[PDB]
Amino acid sequence: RPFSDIITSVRYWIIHSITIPSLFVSGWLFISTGLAYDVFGTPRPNEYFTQDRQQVPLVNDRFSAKQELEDLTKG
Amino acid sequence: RGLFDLVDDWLKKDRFVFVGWSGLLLFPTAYLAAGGWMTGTTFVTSWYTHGLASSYLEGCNFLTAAVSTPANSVGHSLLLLWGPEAQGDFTRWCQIGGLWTFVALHGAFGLIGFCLRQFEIARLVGIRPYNAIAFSGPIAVFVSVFLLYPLGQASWFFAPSFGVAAIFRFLLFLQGFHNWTLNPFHMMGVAGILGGALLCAIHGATVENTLFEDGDAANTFRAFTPTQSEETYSMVTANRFWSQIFGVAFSNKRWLHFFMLFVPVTGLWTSSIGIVGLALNLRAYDFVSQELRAAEDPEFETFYTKNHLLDEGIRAWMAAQDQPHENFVFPEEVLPRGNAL
Amino acid sequence: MEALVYTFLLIGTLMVIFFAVFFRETPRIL
Amino acid sequence: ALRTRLGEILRPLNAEYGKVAPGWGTTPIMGIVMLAFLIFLVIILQIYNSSLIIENVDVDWANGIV
Amino acid sequence: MTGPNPNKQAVELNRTSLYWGLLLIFVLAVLFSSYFFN
Amino acid sequence: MTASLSNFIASLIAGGVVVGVIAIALIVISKSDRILR
Amino acid sequence: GTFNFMLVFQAEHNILMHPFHMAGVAGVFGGSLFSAMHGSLVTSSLIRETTENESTNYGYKFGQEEETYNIVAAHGYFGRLIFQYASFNNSRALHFFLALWPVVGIWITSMGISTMAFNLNGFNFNQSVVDSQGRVINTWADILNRANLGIEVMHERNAHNFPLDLA
Amino acid sequence: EVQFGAYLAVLLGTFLPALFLVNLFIQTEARKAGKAGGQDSD
Amino acid sequence: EVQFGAYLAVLLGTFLPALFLVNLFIQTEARKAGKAGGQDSD
Amino acid sequence: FRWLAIHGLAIPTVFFLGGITAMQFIQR
Amino acid sequence: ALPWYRVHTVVLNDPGRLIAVHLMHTALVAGWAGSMALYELAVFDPSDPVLNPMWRQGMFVMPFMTRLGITDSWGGWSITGESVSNPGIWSFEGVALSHIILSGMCFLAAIWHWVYWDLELFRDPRTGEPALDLPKIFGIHLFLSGLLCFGFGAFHVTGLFGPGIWVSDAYGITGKVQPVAPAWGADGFNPFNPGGIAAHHIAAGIFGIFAGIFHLTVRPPQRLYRALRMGNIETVLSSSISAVFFAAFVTSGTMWYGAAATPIELFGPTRYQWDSGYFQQEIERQVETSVSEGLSESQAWSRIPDKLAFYDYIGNNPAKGGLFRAGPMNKGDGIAEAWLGHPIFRDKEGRELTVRRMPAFFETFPVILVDKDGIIRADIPFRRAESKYSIEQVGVTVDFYGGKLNGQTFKDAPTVKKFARKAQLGEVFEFDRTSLESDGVFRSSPRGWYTYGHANFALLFFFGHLWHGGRTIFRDVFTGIGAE
Amino acid sequence: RIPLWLVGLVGGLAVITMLSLFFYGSYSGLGSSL
Numbered sequence A: 001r002p003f004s005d006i007i008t009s010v011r012y013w014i015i016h017s018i019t020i021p022s023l024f025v026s027g028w029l030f031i032s033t034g035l036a037y038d039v040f041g042t043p044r045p046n047e048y049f050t051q052d053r054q055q056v057p058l059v060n061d062r063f064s065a066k067q068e069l070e071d072l073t074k075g
Numbered sequence B: 001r002g003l004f005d006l007v008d009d010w011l012k013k014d015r016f017v018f019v020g021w022s023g024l025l026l027f028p029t030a031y032l033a034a035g036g037w038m039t040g041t042t043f044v045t046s047w048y049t050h051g052l053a054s055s056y057l058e059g060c061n062f063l064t065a066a067v068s069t070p071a072n073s074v075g076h077s078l079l080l081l082w083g084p085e086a087q088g089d090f091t092r093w094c095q096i097g098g099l100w101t102f103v104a105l106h107g108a109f110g111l112i113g114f115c116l117r118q119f120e121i122a123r124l125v126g127i128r129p130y131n132a133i134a135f136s137g138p139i140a141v142f143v144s145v146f147l148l149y150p151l152g153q154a155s156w157f158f159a160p161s162f163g164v165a166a167i168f169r170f171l172l173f174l175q176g177f178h179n180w181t182l183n184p185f186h187m188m189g190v191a192g193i194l195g196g197a198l199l200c201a202i203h204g205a206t207v208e209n210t211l212f213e214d215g216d217a218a219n220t221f222r223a224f225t226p227t228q229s230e231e232t233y234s235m236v237t238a239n240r241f242w243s244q245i246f247g248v249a250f251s252n253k254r255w256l257h258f259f260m261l262f263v264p265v266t267g268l269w270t271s272s273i274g275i276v277g278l279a280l281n282l283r284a285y286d287f288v289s290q291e292l293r294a295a296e297d298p299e300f301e302t303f304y305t306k307n308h309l310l311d312e313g314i315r316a317w318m319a320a321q322d323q324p325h326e327n328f329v330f331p332e333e334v335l336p337r338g339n340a341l
Numbered sequence C: 001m002e003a004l005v006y007t008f009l010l011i012g013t014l015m016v017i018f019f020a021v022f023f024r025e026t027p028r029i030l
Numbered sequence D: 001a002l003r004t005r006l007g008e009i010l011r012p013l014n015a016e017y018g019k020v021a022p023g024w025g026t027t028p029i030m031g032i033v034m035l036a037f038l039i040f041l042v043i044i045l046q047i048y049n050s051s052l053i054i055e056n057v058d059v060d061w062a063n064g065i066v
Numbered sequence E: 001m002t003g004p005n006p007n008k009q010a011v012e013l014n015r016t017s018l019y020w021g022l023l024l025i026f027v028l029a030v031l032f033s034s035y036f037f038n
Numbered sequence F: 001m002t003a004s005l006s007n008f009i010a011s012l013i014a015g016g017v018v019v020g021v022i023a024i025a026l027i028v029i030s031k032s033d034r035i036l037r
Numbered sequence G: 001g002t003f004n005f006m007l008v009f010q011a012e013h014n015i016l017m018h019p020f021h022m023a024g025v026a027g028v029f030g031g032s033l034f035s036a037m038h039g040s041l042v043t044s045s046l047i048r049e050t051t052e053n054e055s056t057n058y059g060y061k062f063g064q065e066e067e068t069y070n071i072v073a074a075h076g077y078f079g080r081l082i083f084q085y086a087s088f089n090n091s092r093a094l095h096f097f098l099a100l101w102p103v104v105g106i107w108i109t110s111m112g113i114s115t116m117a118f119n120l121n122g123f124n125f126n127q128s129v130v131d132s133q134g135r136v137i138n139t140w141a142d143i144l145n146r147a148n149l150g151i152e153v154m155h156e157r158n159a160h161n162f163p164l165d166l167a
Numbered sequence H, I: 001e002v003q004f005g006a007y008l009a010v011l012l013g014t015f016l017p018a019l020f021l022v023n024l025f026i027q028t029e030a031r032k033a034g035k036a037g038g039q040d041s042d
Numbered sequence J: 001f002r003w004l005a006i007h008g009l010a011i012p013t014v015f016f017l018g019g020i021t022a023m024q025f026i027q028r
Numbered sequence K: 001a002l003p004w005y006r007v008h009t010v011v012l013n014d015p016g017r018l019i020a021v022h023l024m025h026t027a028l029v030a031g032w033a034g035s036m037a038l039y040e041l042a043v044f045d046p047s048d049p050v051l052n053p054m055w056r057q058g059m060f061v062m063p064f065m066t067r068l069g070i071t072d073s074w075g076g077w078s079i080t081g082e083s084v085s086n087p088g089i090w091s092f093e094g095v096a097l098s099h100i101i102l103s104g105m106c107f108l109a110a111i112w113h114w115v116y117w118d119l120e121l122f123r124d125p126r127t128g129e130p131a132l133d134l135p136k137i138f139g140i141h142l143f144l145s146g147l148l149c150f151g152f153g154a155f156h157v158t159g160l161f162g163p164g165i166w167v168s169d170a171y172g173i174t175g176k177v178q179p180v181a182p183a184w185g186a187d188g189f190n191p192f193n194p195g196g197i198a199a200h201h202i203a204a205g206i207f208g209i210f211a212g213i214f215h216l217t218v219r220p221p222q223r224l225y226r227a228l229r230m231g232n233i234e235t236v237l238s239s240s241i242s243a244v245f246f247a248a249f250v251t252s253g254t255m256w257y258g259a260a261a262t263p264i265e266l267f268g269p270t271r272y273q274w275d276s277g278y279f280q281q282e283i284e285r286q287v288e289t290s291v292s293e294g295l296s297e298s299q300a301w302s303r304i305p306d307k308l309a310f311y312d313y314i315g316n317n318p319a320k321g322g323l324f325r326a327g328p329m330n331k332g333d334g335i336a337e338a339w340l341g342h343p344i345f346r347d348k349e350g351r352e353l354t355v356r357r358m359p360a361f362f363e364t365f366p367v368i369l370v371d372k373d374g375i376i377r378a379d380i381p382f383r384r385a386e387s388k389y390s391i392e393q394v395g396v397t398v399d400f401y402g403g404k405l406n407g408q409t410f411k412d413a414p415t416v417k418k419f420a421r422k423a424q425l426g427e428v429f430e431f432d433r434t435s436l437e438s439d440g441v442f443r444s445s446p447r448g449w450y451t452y453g454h455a456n457f458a459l460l461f462f463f464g465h466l467w468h469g470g471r472t473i474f475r476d477v478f479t480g481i482g483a484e
Numbered sequence L: 001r002i003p004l005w006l007v008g009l010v011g012g013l014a015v016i017t018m019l020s021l022f023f024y025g026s027y028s029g030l031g032s033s034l
């Protein structure tokens, strides 16, 4: 099937008037609920520095990098 | 008939996107390399590896977002998600820079898979594999810059990060620390890339201005058939023009189009050789006879010695921020400045 | 003394360019 | 064309040419040997990378007996 | 000596290729001389 | 044996699964969408 | 002296963060890509006119009227390499695209140098990412800024008497 | 003071590959003159 | 300590006149091969 | 069927673009 | 009318002259190895193996002779310092002369195989055309490769019938050639274990013997013969080029990172021993056990060997040279003569300051003194006006320990500043910069030069794999394609 | 059946709107230096 005759058919726009706004909303809710900070470990604007750590947190060990990061992200 | 032959028939079937046997490698690895780069530049920080914001979640725009290299502490670790640094934790994997090695390794096998695709399609169409030979240029650039350069250095940290301004840092890091413009292998690379853009513009404009009258429209794009046998432009007139303008002209269309292949690919291959040398710090840093003369004669100034003072400014003013693991504390009294700046 | 080598290489390069232009193999049809 | 004394000793070693086993032959066995060789190279890469940590294998400069 | 070899071919280098190679060697000598002299 | 070695063997299995589930899906689609004669 | 010109220009104008230099880099990276692309597909699809002993370039005669390469075979290759709709079947439209991409790219970067002549500099994103307390979180533009600072405090080191390089 | 071996590296690195190509071009023209058959073939 | 220009005088005084004679001999054999008319003439 | 080759790019693109559009209204 | 880049394709279907052209490459390579070793023996200085080892003198093939057992010369010296009565044939000079004699013998054999190209052995008895049975020729040459790999491992390396290989301690102080027992466990894959070298060449040699047995008896499949183009000799060139750039990336890796096959007494230290502070930590660890057993600071530091202090100096870093800084490492800083001792910097209150060492990225580095907490206490200021951590203000004094300045205190700030500048390069040595007329810029080691050549050769050989592999598969269209 | 220029109209109006939001977000919120 050709391309431009698909996107001009009304059956294409019956399907994609629901699926495209539902994915756009679901991407919006991935940020609005704060889930993307917890999945990827990105700091929220509150939590670049904590009350104990006023410095920039760096990992200085290779094999305890997972445990050193858990101590830097506890607050 | 055979089970191999049924799969070989299905993979090489003429469809909208050709798959082939090489698509079993290219389409997984290139999708994860591109999709891993979009995931990192949108969501994943560099706050624990570099101390930077590098995603759109943190306020970066397209120019300043990057997938940054891992921390210097992990060395040349492969940083597998199941490996001994992340240990299956996806969140800790993204924070130690595991997406960099994800993008760089799946991107390395995507370039293998794309060059295998060029070999596979040329074997089915029945032409010569010169496009796969020309893609060895971009492969030699990626292998030598993103893999071989950090492997000769201390860690993956000194590799280029996968961003726009992060690449701009890598350009200026290698001027200050390696004097990479002075390297004659970068110079051969600049000649091949500017020579390739020149050859693109000259051959593009010479064909377009030596066209034959093949229609009555002033729009000359309609007067070409893709299956015609006649040449659409006058090679004799084009050779006559450049022989009197420039003194020298192409006379062979086969040699002309091989030369359009040869110049940028040689430029990418010669510049890949000198960046393998910078991996081991075998750099073209100093002309020692000018350094020895300027040491004992304090008016001997060239544009050469002026560039070394720029590099000593770069290496002192960026090193505390660009290598934060090293804990460089330079007081203001030791930073090299000129007067009043 | 190395400026003698630098001058000879540049002047020698321009002499090749002279012969490449005015002593070129003329493109001929048939 | 020239028959030599050493050339007659080595002559059966070049006597076959283009002699093939029919069909797919030993290609399934060759792919298994190639696959185990790929796993073997991934093992010794990751040991030396310290992505694979084995007991009593300390990848560091060692004391050869002097 | 065995027979005359049937694989013997002629070698060509036209005037264009001479000028391209003379230019390449002189320009590589121009480029790399400053580094060799150091 | 170690946690690093058991995770490595688990990745050869998981690597063989995603090679397997592509290959099994590639066999069954080459039998269904075979080329008519 | 050219490299001295480039580094001082980056410190004083941030040319790397200027989009007109970015279009120029896309002009010369794309132009040498398209040169190597167009040069590959013609050389890939040359018609048999020579033997294995002579050079392949002797299959073209200067002044011949016939096409020297199969442009259908090159279009069928590149149409399967990416997808069919992304390839030029018109050789006149293709050679026009070979002329336009580096020339417009070099035109734009020439108007980057000409507009950074009057100090309309590249993008300044220094201290633009700020956390909740107000502290500056650095970005890659800030590390680029630390390299710009190192060139500008060291360039023309005796020429300046006053704290701003307004020239 | 410059490295004294660089005079050999530049001048033999120029002359010997240049005289190799001059050698290849001259025997190409001499082979064409011999096949042409007149006054230059001998 | 020897004179440093003598390395150039000996090595270019050897190689350049030797490669001139190698040039003359090779074009002599190529001219004979072109006039011979078979497989080496082209 | 050519669905999951164009939808492997288009579905994460619209998801990511919905996220980046929501990011413009995040303040510190 | 061959182009210049196709001239050597005249031996593509001439198996007698392919052997002759490979015997001449073999003659040139062996002739290089004999004459490079003779040149290196003419300029080697075997008088101070401690502070002027072979990797400070730019010796390139000399560490490869010593790695496998050649320690002595005909001149009576060894590189271990052990004076020798009569080394016999396999000295450094006798190995160089044997590579020269082998070069001349391969040269005469190349003339014979070029002249007598038309041997009946190279003809196909089915067709009469010149053919090579590359499946069985591979089975022959793989079987001999297994016998040479096994025999090198079983006899040369284990010292059954051989000298062994070079082994060393963990810090490159005492090294020797000795037989090496094979390590059959998982520690045989530890690349710093020398027993893995013996265990590899025995096991891989057995694999090469019996795969050579297999490849001698079993014909290839019909599908694999046609797919891999096993009648075309350029399919072998493509896969051999791939096998040889693979191997050159491995040798560049183990040279640059370090292995038991690349010892630091033959090739020099690596760049990672300077970054990690490898010799500095051991020098401290030896000093602290000496002050634990009732010795002073001056007596502890005098127990440090000068060979150990020489490794802890940035001029021996292979990542400190330049691409065109030509020659030995002695051409840079001079020939090392004596360790000056370990400086200890103290200010007026008395706590020890240490100069922050120069990292290998930096050609220049600011002189900065920190305490045990890393806090800046003193430096040498660029701008002197509002300087607050200058050495004249803080009053830094320097005490030396060990070396040639062993009991000596410097308190005036001019000479303390002179010693702080050399303390950022690691351990300070007295050099002789007038024998080689040294310029003052660091060169790279033979370890750094090997990695340069072989990682750039491996990159260039990757293109040759793509070219010759594409030339194999596409052989029927390399004069062009058909228009029909 | 929809005219193809009408799809490119509202498709280009969506791209203009989204890039206007990306350029608005450079002056507001995160990354705005405010």
Ligand code: CLA
Binding pocket: K026, K027, K029, K030, K032, K033, K034, K037, K061, K062, K064, K065, K067, K068, K095, K096, K099, K102, K145, K146, K149, K204, K205, K207, K208, K209, K247
């Ligand atoms: C006759 C036997 C012989 C012997 C005993 C020697 C001995 C020596 N050679 Mg000489 N050499 C020889 C012949 C010999 N050579 C020939 C014929 C040539 C011309 C090719 C040379 C060219 C040569 C050069 C250029 C050099 C030497 C050097 C040396 C010295 C160091 C050896 C070394 O470190 O290599 C180490 C050898 C290897 C690492 C070999 C690698 C083998 C690879 C890994 C095989 C991989 C492919 C394999 C087939 C795969 C399948 C394996 C299978 C079992 C599974 C040593 C004294 C060096 C030297 O110090 O000169 C003074 C040196 O630089 N040789």
Ligand code: CLA
Binding pocket: B143, B147, B148, D041, D042, D044, D045, D048, K183, K184, K185, K187, K188, K189, K190, K191, K196, K197, K199, K200, K201, K203, K204, K207, K208, K245, K246, K249, K250, K254, K259
């Ligand atoms: C008793 C059993 C035994 C033991 C103890 C050993 C021991 C060893 N083997 Mg051996 N081996 C054996 C049997 C054994 N072998 C058998 C039966 C075979 C089959 C014939 C082999 C085949 C084999 C090969 C092919 C190799 C070894 C290697 C080694 C060494 C590994 C340590 C090292 O330095 O590698 C370092 C780690 C690697 C080389 C990892 C390999 C991954 C490669 C390098 C990836 C990169 C490839 C790519 C093309 C390069 C570009 C990438 C990027 C830069 C762009 C160690 C001495 C390695 C070696 O010789 O090292 C000097 C090696 O390459 N072995």
Ligand code: CLA
Binding pocket: E025, E026, E028, E029, E032, H009, H010, H013, H014, K040, K043, K057, K058, K059, K060, K323, K324, K325, K326, K327, K328, K445, K446, K449, K450, K451, K453, K454
């Ligand atoms: C694998 C190859 C290899 C490697 C790693 C080494 C390594 C070494 N050599 Mg050896 N050497 C080699 C092969 C090699 N050699 C060969 C094949 C020869 C015969 C020509 C020699 C002859 C030789 C001599 C006479 C000497 C050495 C020396 C050395 C040592 C110092 C290196 C140096 O300062 O280079 C300097 C840097 C360069 C030469 C730059 C390399 C070339 C660059 C990349 C440009 C590439 C060429 C360019 C494109 C063409 C020029 C253009 C032209 C038109 C002018 C170092 C250990 C020295 C030593 O210390 O011995 C005790 C020494 O005196 N070598």
Ligand code: CLA
Binding pocket: K004, K005, K006, K007, K008, K009, K237, K241, K460, K461, K462, K463, K464, K465, K467, K468, K471
């Ligand atoms: C063992 C490795 C090996 C072998 C046996 C071959 C063999 C061949 N190559 Mg291949 N190739 C290789 C590696 C190899 N190549 C590598 C590493 C590359 C990437 C650089 C290539 C890229 C390549 C291309 C693009 C072409 C070939 C061609 C050829 C064929 C003719 C060569 C010729 O006549 O040139 C004659 C060479 C000269 C007249 C002078 C060349 C001078 C060079 C550039 C510098 C001097 C070299 C120096 C003295 C040696 C340094 C030693 C170093 C290699 C260790 C021949 C079959 C040609 C072909 O396919 O023919 C149909 C061809 O077009 N090769």
Ligand SMILES: CC(C)=CCC/C(C)=C/CC/C(C)=C/CC/C(C)=C/CC/C(C)=C/CC/C(C)=C/CC/C(C)=C/CC/C(C)=C/CC/C(C)=C/CC1=CC(=O)C(C)=C(C)C1=O
Binding pocket: B027, B030, B031, B034, G033, G034, G035, G037, G038, G039, G041, G042, G071, G074, G075, G078, G079, G082, G086, G087, G088, G089, G094, J004, J005, J006, J007, J008, J009
């Ligand atoms: C079942 C389960 C579990 C579900 C999981 C879902 C899943 C499997 C998802 C995976 C989906 C996935 C990602 C697959 C999609 C595959 C995919 C596309 C991945 C790759 C990733 C990626 C983003 C790729 C994009 C890269 C790309 C294609 C870039 C190319 C861009 C492009 C249009 C380039 C054209 C450039 C151009 C115009 C050049 C022409 C100019 C030029 C000089 C031509 C020369 C020339 C041309 C001729 O024409 C002819 C004639 C001649 C003479 C000639 O000279």
Ligand SMILES: CCCCCCCCCCCCCCCC(=O)OC[C@H](COP(=O)(O)OC[C@@H](O)CO)OC(=O)CCCCCCCCCCCCCCC
Binding pocket: B245, B246, B247, B248, B249, B250, B251, B252, B253, B255, B256, C010, C013, C014, C017, C020, C021, C024, C027, E014, E016, E017, E019, E020, E023, E027, G057
């Ligand atoms: C002011 C107006 C007059 C213009 C000034 C003249 C300048 C002309 C420069 C010609 C150089 C010739 C190159 C020789 C080679 C030669 O003569 O080639 C002539 C060649 C003719 O090719 P044909 O198609 O005839 O070749 C078919 C076969 O013969 C292929 O071998 O033309 C081209 O291939 C080259 C066209 C690009 C020309 C590139 C020029 C490179 C620029 C110069 C780079 C050096 C500058 C160094 C400065 C130190």
Ligand SMILES: CC1=C(/C=C/C(C)=C/C=C/C(C)=C/C=C/C=C(C)/C=C/C=C(C)/C=C/C2=C(C)CCCC2(C)C)C(C)(C)CCC1
Binding pocket: B031, B032, B034, B035, B036, B037, B038, B039, B102, J008, J009, J012, J013, J016, J017, L015, L019
């Ligand atoms: C990492 C990872 C992963 C993931 C991956 C993937 C799957 C991803 C995907 C992703 C993706 C795939 C994404 C995408 C996105 C996209 C986007 C976001 C785009 C955008 C664009 C833009 C915005 C542009 C713009 C424009 C337009 C639109 C038009 C006009 C012009 C312009 C260019 C401006 C996984 C899971 C494997 C796991 C592991 C890791």
Ligand SMILES: CC1=C(/C=C/C(C)=C/C=C/C(C)=C/C=C/C=C(C)/C=C/C=C(C)/C=C/C2=C(C)CCCC2(C)C)C(C)(C)CCC1
Binding pocket: K028, K029, K031, K032, K035, K100, K101, K102, K103, K104, K105, K107, K108
């Ligand atoms: C005949 C005879 C003989 C003799 C022998 C001889 C005497 C030999 C010698 C030999 C020799 C004496 C040889 C040598 C050789 C050398 C070589 C072969 C070299 C080469 C080189 C090259 C190749 C290089 C290049 C380069 C450069 C220059 C730079 C850098 C880059 C490169 C590395 C590439 C005898 C009596 C025994 C016996 C009988 C017979």
Ligand code: OEX
Binding pocket: G008, G012, G155, G156, G159, G165, G166, G167
């Ligand atoms: O002249 Mn050339 O560079 Ca424009 O800024 Mn002001 O002036 Mn000078 O300083 Mn900075």
Ligand SMILES: [Fe+2]
Binding pocket: B203, B207, B257, G038, G042, G095
């Ligand atoms: Fe064209």
